[PDB]
Write a protein that binds this ligand. Structure first.
Ligand SMILES: *[C@@H]1O[C@H](CO)[C@@H](O[C@@H]2O[C@H](CO)[C@@H](O[C@@H]3O[C@H](CO)[C@@H](O)[C@H](O)[C@@H]3O)[C@H](O)[C@H]2NC(C)=O)[C@H](O)[C@H]1NC(C)=O
Ligand SMILES: *[C@@H]1O[C@H](CO)[C@@H](O[C@@H]2O[C@H](CO)[C@@H](O[C@@H]3O[C@H](CO)[C@@H](O)[C@H](O)[C@@H]3O)[C@H](O)[C@H]2NC(C)=O)[C@H](O)[C@H]1NC(C)=O
Ligand SMILES: *[C@@H]1O[C@H](CO)[C@@H](O[C@@H]2O[C@H](CO)[C@@H](O[C@@H]3O[C@H](CO)[C@@H](O)[C@H](O)[C@@H]3O)[C@H](O)[C@H]2NC(C)=O)[C@H](O)[C@H]1NC(C)=O
Ligand SMILES: *[C@@H]1O[C@H](CO)[C@@H](O[C@@H]2O[C@H](CO)[C@@H](O[C@@H]3O[C@H](CO)[C@@H](O)[C@H](O)[C@@H]3O)[C@H](O)[C@H]2NC(C)=O)[C@H](O)[C@H]1NC(C)=O
Ligand SMILES: *[C@@H]1O[C@H](CO)[C@@H](O[C@@H]2O[C@H](CO)[C@@H](O)[C@H](O)[C@H]2NC(C)=O)[C@H](O)[C@H]1NC(C)=O
Ligand SMILES: *[C@@H]1O[C@H](CO)[C@@H](O[C@@H]2O[C@H](CO)[C@@H](O)[C@H](O)[C@H]2NC(C)=O)[C@H](O)[C@H]1NC(C)=O
Ligand SMILES: *[C@@H]1O[C@H](CO)[C@@H](O[C@@H]2O[C@H](CO)[C@@H](O)[C@H](O)[C@H]2NC(C)=O)[C@H](O)[C@H]1NC(C)=O
Ligand SMILES: *[C@@H]1O[C@H](CO)[C@@H](O[C@@H]2O[C@H](CO)[C@@H](O)[C@H](O)[C@H]2NC(C)=O)[C@H](O)[C@H]1NC(C)=O
Ligand SMILES: *[C@@H]1O[C@H](CO)[C@@H](O[C@@H]2O[C@H](CO)[C@@H](O)[C@H](O)[C@H]2NC(C)=O)[C@H](O)[C@H]1NC(C)=O
Ligand SMILES: *[C@@H]1O[C@H](CO)[C@@H](O[C@@H]2O[C@H](CO)[C@@H](O)[C@H](O)[C@H]2NC(C)=O)[C@H](O)[C@H]1NC(C)=O
Ligand SMILES: *[C@@H]1O[C@H](CO)[C@@H](O[C@@H]2O[C@H](CO)[C@@H](O)[C@H](O)[C@H]2NC(C)=O)[C@H](O)[C@H]1NC(C)=O
Ligand SMILES: *[C@@H]1O[C@H](CO)[C@@H](O[C@@H]2O[C@H](CO)[C@@H](O)[C@H](O)[C@H]2NC(C)=O)[C@H](O)[C@H]1NC(C)=O
Ligand SMILES: *[C@@H]1O[C@H](CO)[C@@H](O[C@@H]2O[C@H](CO)[C@@H](O)[C@H](O)[C@H]2NC(C)=O)[C@H](O)[C@H]1NC(C)=O
Ligand code: NAG
Ligand code: NAG
Ligand code: NAG
Ligand code: NAG
Ligand code: NAG
Ligand code: NAG
Ligand code: NAG
Ligand code: NAG
Ligand code: NAG
Ligand code: NAG
Ligand code: NAG
Ligand code: NAG
Ligand code: NAG
Ligand code: NAG
Ligand code: NAG
Ligand code: NAG
Lengths: 445, 131, 130, 127, 48
């Protein structure tokens, strides 16, 4: 046959491979995100019609790289801060009595101790307020920090803030980022509307364990994603199409006092409180949460049997970061009790609720007992207004004949929070080598 | 024509199009083809892209195409590789399907393209030495 | 002719010369074109220089100049960019002034050059099909 | 089967015996401290390959492994017969003395290729 | 500062004086407390 092979360069061939993405930001700067090049204005969005890409989450390396980058950025951010080694001393500690309430009785502690100063030849006796979960009894009894027997750690510097500024992930040379534009995109499957983009959209790296705070909304309805819906050990990601507003607050008028512990460096201790002391809490609208739970039940009835009784229950047990909803509010870490949000059952057919939250000062939030971080106190009351757009459920299997299906909040891993937002993007490698038959030959000179 | 702009197809715009329509947008893909932990990772990615580009250019250099995108060869096309009409592949098939269809033989195809050019090269040599 | 010494024009020595005089000093510029913080900064600088040279080589490769320094093109030169005589633009103008004169039309020229070469390759492919 | 030679197998061979096994050598040119060391050596190798390719692209050998030039060879640098140097001499022995005279050779090749390009441009202009 | 004594608990005569039972005051997890602990050391890496 009069056919000859011809090679073509720059052909659009996509292969799946590992690729280290590039950081980007809108760009005084804080949280040390200036280490990466800023994003380019007006990112290009190119629609790719007549092609279907088999998107598959739970195996994408973008979320793993994002987790590693967040861990590395946090470790580099805690590097210039001062270590808190002299705090591991004997603490003559007692309870609090001034305007204390019944629910907050025994939660806060007034601990006095001897600490070094800028002069190594002398010490000083100071006092500070510590939470119950922050100190443990050694045996006016003696107490000690919870991280003394474990490795010591630094504290958050007052100049840096915990604002989760959005970041963008740009592919390097020779790689492309594919985004699924389907309104009802499933967990795994061929996306009909695919579009390439230079950099990803604004993704806020928030920290949460049970409720997805400030996440990306859905397109038209709440979505249920899972690697194996029939497996009870697999987390169930729920994305909301409407945001459920939440108001978290700490009415304690805490005062921060700086005490010198060494040459130049200082420790920010909790001073005397001002006025009445009350337990920090979060308020959620009852009507919005009820209709959101109804929509969630309606979506779960499509996967499982719609004539199956469903019920929500609280966490079983384990660590406090997994059982209680842990997040951050104005630099103060909160651990809220979600028993009031998962205490309802649904059959087959104005007012708001409050949730008490505990406050800790030693927070790991990454299961890295290897180290910790001391959250310094924040002056004044703490107020936070936000809106949850997702959930991380877990099926409590053990029943039979598809009866008494119960759902409990879980997902202690930090990858689910980023998997719920980076599900649309995929990294592909461009192969410029191509071959095709053509009726042509190279002329001999 | 002096008050008109220049607009071309975007990156990978003709991925789902025909071969004849995607053969005219190779220029954009060819042009788009090219605290110390962050720096090491970024430099490693940039360098890796550099050896991939040089490997592609070296694979094209051993053939009779010194840099041109579209180029013809003198080796015959084996009909046993596809046994299909040229009209339907160039008018009713994308580059993705064509790539997964003959993904096996491409490697050995490259080898013939290479040695063939090698002997072809010495062909002009034993003729150019006749001057 | 056994003790003959050969000397050439220096690096960028033909900057103030005319276009024709500087046209023969392209090879010298072409050949001369090529503790952890210091190593990474110098490595990044060398990688950036290599990437810039690679981008320039690819820019000349997408056109019909894959390797040759001097090359022509079938597309004509419109007078909208620069309407000057050839007798004085090559003997009474340097590369700096000429580059600063039409610096606003470089992207248009590059785009028309790449599309002209693409259609030229397509026409050559259609001609070889006979 | 087919067996030609391996990498650097014609080092001790003569000029003509090593004139056809140049293409395999042509493709042969291409805890954190060890990673940066490997990256530095890799960048150096890439730079050497690009420098060699650039020097070949300057002359009339942009994409050819075998190429001749219109410059007359100066007999003062060799002073030997063609068959004697191409049949009873290796590449290493010739490299021992051509190293001092390779700079002038490279310079003359560059200026001659530039002159040839200028002549070609004038020929295309005059049609 | 180390307080070392000679060990004479089923020791061969070839090593009479090679192993030393030392005792010292070392800090603990709490910076305000110290503990008296013992350890065995060799005569080559211990000087008077
Ligand atoms: C935690 O416990 C400490 C004591 O261990 C409390 O310190 C208290 O501080 C106040 C204000 O400095 C002291 O009041 C004193 O009043 C006299 C006049 O009556 C005045 O002359 C002094 O200069 C001083 O202002 C108070 O004596 C002191 N308590 C003790 C037992 O000495 C601290 O208030 C406690 N914090 C909380 C939140 O309960
Ligand atoms: C989810 O997003 C909302 C807003 O969309 C976040 O609320 C905002 O949080 C920041 C930081 O906590 C607040 O900034 C603060 O403003 C006061 C004003 O005086 C300033 O003194 C502080 O230094 C700080 O800059 C901001 O007011 C607040 N509200 C708005 C409307 O922006 C919320 O924090 C996000 N959730 C999480 C978990 O980050
Ligand atoms: C995605 O696929 C659709 C369906 O083929 C493409 O729409 C039409 O595709 C044809 C062939 O590629 C285009 O050419 C036209 O062919 C007809 C014969 O069928 C001929 O009579 C016309 O003169 C023309 O040459 C056609 O322009 C195109 N669009 C229409 C009909 O509106 C579509 O182009 C594909 N998408 C991409 C990005 O290629
Ligand atoms: C290539 O593009 C640049 C940038 O647009 C051009 O520079 C611009 O040139 C104009 C004059 O040609 C400058 O306008 C000046 O404005 C001042 C204040 O109104 C006036 O006093 C002057 O008499 C003159 O009209 C303009 O400032 C300058 N820069 C910018 C940013 O626009 C350049 O002229 C273009 N070259 C060619 C050959 O087209
Ligand atoms: C801080 O230091 C003071 C004095 O140095 C301690 O007060 C007394 O210290 C003497 C030792 O000189 C002890 O014999 C007493 O028992 C101490 N008094 C009390 C009431 O304990 C004080 O104990 C030190 N504080 C801490 C937390 O160790
Ligand atoms: C998804 O979950 C289902 C239900 O648990 C799995 O099906 C069973 O898995 C167990 C253990 O893996 C096997 O012993 C059974 O034989 C499976 N049942 C059947 C009918 O095959 C299933 O393996 C999970 N994974 C996938 C990929 O479907
Ligand atoms: C959280 O606090 C905000 C405070 O702004 C509440 O916003 C209210 O929004 C309605 C809507 O029209 C207004 O009429 C009210 O005046 C707003 N409140 C105030 C104090 O101005 C929001 O409802 C609160 N959310 C929850 C769940 O408590
Ligand atoms: C609630 O979530 C939404 C979406 O994540 C946030 O965005 C705003 O939502 C309101 C009402 O839906 C729109 O009118 C605005 O245009 C949205 N954008 C901005 C920049 O405001 C919204 O901020 C969240 N609510 C709170 C209190 O943070
Ligand atoms: C490449 O050749 C193989 C046969 O060696 C073709 O068949 C594949 O064989 C592997 C294991 O040998 C299986 O895992 C694949 O599932 C087979 N493919 C199919 C489609 O059944 C293969 O199809 C060839 N690929 C081409 C021609 O692109
Ligand atoms: C700088 O400009 C002078 C002036 O043109 C150049 O010197 C020569 O001047 C005579 C004057 O009649 C001209 O005819 C020659 O053509 C000029 N020489 C050349 C090579 O053009 C001088 O060469 C220029 N030098 C540089 C470095 O540009
Ligand atoms: C080493 O040298 C010997 C002799 O110099 C080479 O032997 C020659 O081999 C070729 C074919 O390979 C014959 O045509 C010649 O006649 C042989 N020479 C003699 C004198 O008999 C041998 O090939 C060389 N080996 C290498 C690896 O270069
Ligand atoms: C190439 O250069 C070297 C050094 O410039 C020359 O080496 C000379 O060798 C002779 C005899 O071996 C010595 O007497 C000289 O002293 C050497 N020169 C120096 C500077 O030490 C070598 O001869 C040159 N090659 C040719 C072919 O001339
Ligand atoms: C460890 O410290 C204790 C003191 O807490 C030392 O015991 C004696 O302490 C008194 C003061 O109460 C001193 O006057 C003595 O000189 C100390 N030594 C002795 C032998 O009585 C104890 O000796 C220290 N241990 C070591 C190994 O230095
Ligand atoms: C430190 O003490 C706490 C107190 O109960 C204990 O739970 C923890 O296991 C201890 N850690 C180590 C490393 O001893
Ligand atoms: C959609 O996702 C669910 C959850 O993994 C799965 O059970 C179902 O089979 C998927 N459907 C399709 C069409 O991919
Ligand atoms: C907290 O106490 C300070 C003390 O001066 C006062 O100025 C401030 O208004 C108080 N804040 C609240 C919310 O009561
Ligand atoms: C939350 O609701 C309770 C009533 O249940 C109310 O007393 C409290 O002030 C509310 N807090 C906020 C911050 O809205
Ligand atoms: C939640 O909404 C459903 C709507 O079907 C309604 O029947 C139910 O009474 C609501 N529950 C509460 C507590 O408002
Ligand atoms: C609800 O369950 C019944 C039980 O047979 C079934 O017939 C019906 O189709 C189901 N409806 C939906 C919307 O799943
Ligand atoms: C869950 O709820 C039950 C019943 O209200 C309670 O006994 C248990 O302690 C709760 N567990 C957690 C972790 O809140
Ligand atoms: C959360 O609140 C419920 C309400 O009774 C309570 O039983 C449970 O113990 C609380 N959880 C924790 C961790 O205290
Ligand atoms: C959970 O629901 C049951 C149902 O009647 C109710 O008795 C109980 O008080 C509820 N607990 C909480 C903490 O809302
Ligand atoms: C310049 O003129 C040529 C023909 O003389 C024409 O093809 C081209 O479009 C013109 N370009 C502009 C920018 O006017
Ligand atoms: C084509 O491929 C077949 C096997 O698929 C092989 O036997 C044959 O030699 C090849 N070449 C030609 C020219 O047919
Ligand atoms: C290929 O095309 C020819 C004419 O162009 C036609 O006769 C033949 O049937 C076609 N073969 C197939 C398999 O379509
Ligand atoms: C030999 O080299 C010299 C330069 O050293 C040169 O001037 C001379 O012309 C050359 N001879 C020939 C015959 O080319
Ligand atoms: C350009 O050449 C024309 C003749 O072709 C002449 O009339 C004109 O003066 C020249 N202009 C310049 C600036 O040399
Ligand atoms: C070249 O060959 C001839 C004939 O064998 C010989 O006389 C002459 O010496 C040779 N040249 C050299 C430089 O040895
Ligand atoms: C320990 O043994 C060494 C070596 O025999 C001896 O010099 C030293 O005096 C002994 N010390 C005591 C306290 O017995």
């Amino acid at each position: 046959e009069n056919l000859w092979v011809t090679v073509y360069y720059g052909v659009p061939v996509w292969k799946d491979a590992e690729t280290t993405l590039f950081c980007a930001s809108d760009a005084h700067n804080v949280w040390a995100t200036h280490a990466c090049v800023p994003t380019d204005p007006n990112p290009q969005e190119i629609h790719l019609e007549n092609v279907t890409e088999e998107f598959n989450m739970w195996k994408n390396n973008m979320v793993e790289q994002m987790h590693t980058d967040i861990i590395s950025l946090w470790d580099q951010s805690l590097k210039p801060c001062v270590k808190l080694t002299p705090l591991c001393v004997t603490l003559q500690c007692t309870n609090v009595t001034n305007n204390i309430t019944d629910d907050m009785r025994g939660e806060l502690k007034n601990c006095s101790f001897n600490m070094t100063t800028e002069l190594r030849d002398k010490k000083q006796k100071v006092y500070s307020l510590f939470y119950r979960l922050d100190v443990v009894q050694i045996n006016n009894k003696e107490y000690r920090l919870i991280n003394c027997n474990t490795s010591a750690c630094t504290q958050a510097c007052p100049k840096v803030s915990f604002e989760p500024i959005p970041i963008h992930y740009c592919a390097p040379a020779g790689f492309a980022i594919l985004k699924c534009k389907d309104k009802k995109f499933n967990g795994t499957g061929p996306c009909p509307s695919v579009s390439t983009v230079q950099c990803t959209h604004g993704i806020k790296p928030v920290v949460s364990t049970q409720l997805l705070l400030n996440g990306s909304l859905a397109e038209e309805e709440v979505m249920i994603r899972s690697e194996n819906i029939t497996n009870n050990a697999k987390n169930i990601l729920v994305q909301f199409n409407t945001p459920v507003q939440i108001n978290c607050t700490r009415p304690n008028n805490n005062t921060r006092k700086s005490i010198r512990i060494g040459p130049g460096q200082a420790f920010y201790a909790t001073g005397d409180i001002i006025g009445d002391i009350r337990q920090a809490h979060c308020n959620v609208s009852k009507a919005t949460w009820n209709e959101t739970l109804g929509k969630v039940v309606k979506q779960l009835r499509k996967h499982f049997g719609n004539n199956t009784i469903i019920r929500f229950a609280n966490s079983s047990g384990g660590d406090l970061e997994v059982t209680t909803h842990s997040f951050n509010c104005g630099g103060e870490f909160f651990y809220c009790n979600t028993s009031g949000l998962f205490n309802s059952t649904w059959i087959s057919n104005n007012d708001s609720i409050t949730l008490p939250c505990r406050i800790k000062q030693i927070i790991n939030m990454w299961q890295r007992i290897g180290q910790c971080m001391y959250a310094p106190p924040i002056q004044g009351v703490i107020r936070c207004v936000s809106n949850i757009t997702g959930l991380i459920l877990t099926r409590d299997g053990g029943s039979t004949n598809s009866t008494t299906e119960t759902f409990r909040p879980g997902g202690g891993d930090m990858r689910d929070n980023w998997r719920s937002e980076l599900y649309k993007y995929k990294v592909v490698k461009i192969e410029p080598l191509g071959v095709a038959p053509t009726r042509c030959k190279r002329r001999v000179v | 024509a002096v008050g008109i702009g220049a607009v071309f197809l975007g990156f990978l715009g003709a991925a789902g199009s025909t071969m004849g329509a995607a053969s005219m947008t190779l220029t954009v893909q060819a042009r788009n083809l090219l605290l110390t932990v962050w720096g090491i990772k970024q430099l490693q990615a940039r360098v890796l892209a550099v050896e991939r580009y040089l490997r592609d250019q070296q694979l094209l250099g051993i053939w009779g195409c010194s840099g041109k995108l579209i180029c013809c060869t003198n080796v015959p096309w084996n009909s046993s590789w596809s046994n299909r009409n040229l009209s339907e592949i160039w008018d009713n098939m994308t580059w993705l399907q064509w790539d997964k269809e003959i993904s096996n033989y491409t490697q050995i195809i490259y080898g013939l393209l290479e040695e063939s050019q090698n002997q072809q090269e010495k062909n002009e040599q034993d003729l150019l030495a006749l001057d």
